[PDB]
Amino acid sequence: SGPLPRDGWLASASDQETANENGRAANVLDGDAATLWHSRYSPAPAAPLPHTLTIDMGVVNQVAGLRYLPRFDNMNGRVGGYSIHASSNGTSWNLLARGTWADNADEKTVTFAAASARYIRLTASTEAGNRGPWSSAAEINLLGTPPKGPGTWSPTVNFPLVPAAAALLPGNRLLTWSAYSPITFGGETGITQSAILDLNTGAVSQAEVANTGHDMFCPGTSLLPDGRILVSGGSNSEKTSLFSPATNTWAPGPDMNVGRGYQSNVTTSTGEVFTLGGSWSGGLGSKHGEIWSSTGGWRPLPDVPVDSILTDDPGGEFRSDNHAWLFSAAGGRVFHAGPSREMNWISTAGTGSVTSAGTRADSADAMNGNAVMYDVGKILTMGGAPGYDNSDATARAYTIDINNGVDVARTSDMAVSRSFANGVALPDGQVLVVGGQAHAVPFTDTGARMAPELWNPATEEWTAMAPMAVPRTYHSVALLLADGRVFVGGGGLCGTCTTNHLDGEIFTPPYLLNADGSARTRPTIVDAPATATAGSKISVTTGSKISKFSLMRMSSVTHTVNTDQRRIPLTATGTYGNNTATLTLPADRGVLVPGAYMLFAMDGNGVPSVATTIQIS
């Protein structure tokens, strides 16, 4: 067995010193030979033997051994007699090994029969020289093999920047950007580093964007009906820039009435863009509603006040107006689902108005959690923390049904708690959750959740997927690709820090794999219209008989916010032709929000085709 990778591992103990030196449990995982876990010895009385050190791996690995690295500075607390326990579920534990280690500074190794475990506990019974009631350790490694499947990961893909915002383009290309710099941010320099990854060839084009005077770090994003991507606020808090995928260039838009950052933008049923909140930039507070049209620019909605969306963040309005969970709803309305406990109905006519939707059951505030629309008027919320900064994340998930009402229920908890994660609606109706960490501290990788999970509406259960290789915490992104795979990238963007990830990885979901790990034969779309109108009947030819399709709106994503994606399942009617079917698009543009969609054919095993692009008006 080689050592397992320790990304995301969290160490805790019976007792630990912090008064007389830094003896925290967490020091066994940092890789530094000079930093120790030491049992608590001050004040008197010192804590007595035995002492325990527990490791939560975040995942159910196969464990076949443990490596103990003693301190190098002196002999105090070198473990003598030892016990090793394992749990998969947290509650029942099993002995795998028991022994004694000699009184020297040599790294010790213990190997046993392979065991399925998320947790490994080391009990120290004696101090190898009986010098005192002490245990200590510089490093703990674990030997064995990580889970393979379900699903599979690509190798990492090199990026020339930290991809901290991202959008899917037609033609199987992915636009990403960072800030004025590939690896840091700040000021209002009016330049953004960008990179387009070609999903076919793996090639990356890098482009500095200076023509619109906009550093587009920390903005609101959405997809427009005509195909363009509107990006407003951020480091240049008043700017609007629009990206055209025909030209692959940016064009200046008009300024917002008030600058903002970390706000939420959402394309409405009319193809206008509504925005609310965002005190990260442009000033503190009063970040009330605005709406953009292409003919009139940004107009104020003074009767859409921010007060309704504010969480009880300890950081106040700087954080409490961040990253609202905004959705286009039937009828042309906007729905606010969170992260605040309080949910709202927003109307954009006139000066606007807000109506309370009541709370999200008994959820606490869920800042940096995800909300994902997996069907018509059906949303799944999950993860988040009551606070933006230094705050315990939750594993709780709540469903919300907004069809002719508001109906909230609590669903299954995730196997791990997450903040800073991303959510991705998949074509089969399931929802993937990716990344995040256990305790929200922006710019850290500590307690990163390495194994995505998949929620099946049919049973409301979460299933763990094969884990990825790079932690994806703050400033990470994930989104659906047209071949049905999921891109994950980014993390960090903190300058001389050691947590920048200038890469991504691509997840192949279980729906594309045979039991043996060979690629599943997929349905194929042979012919389909490239444009269509809400309420239209359209004709689709597949290469075999298909009766279920998914319209999946294309995504933009940053800082956990994705107002664009949504699943609209359609039932095919058979016609006279050879595996040619009719689909009927919903007439309601509140539901069928205009923009770029990926149309997917779903086979009887629920395997999806590669999608085709259809621009819906």
């Binding site: 890789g31 530094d32 030979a33 000079a34 930093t35 690295l69 500075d73 510089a138 490093e139």
Partner: peptide, 6 residues
């Protein structure tokens, strides 16, 4: 591993 020193 690495070391920061004592």
């Amino acid at each position: 591993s690495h070391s920061s020193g004592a």
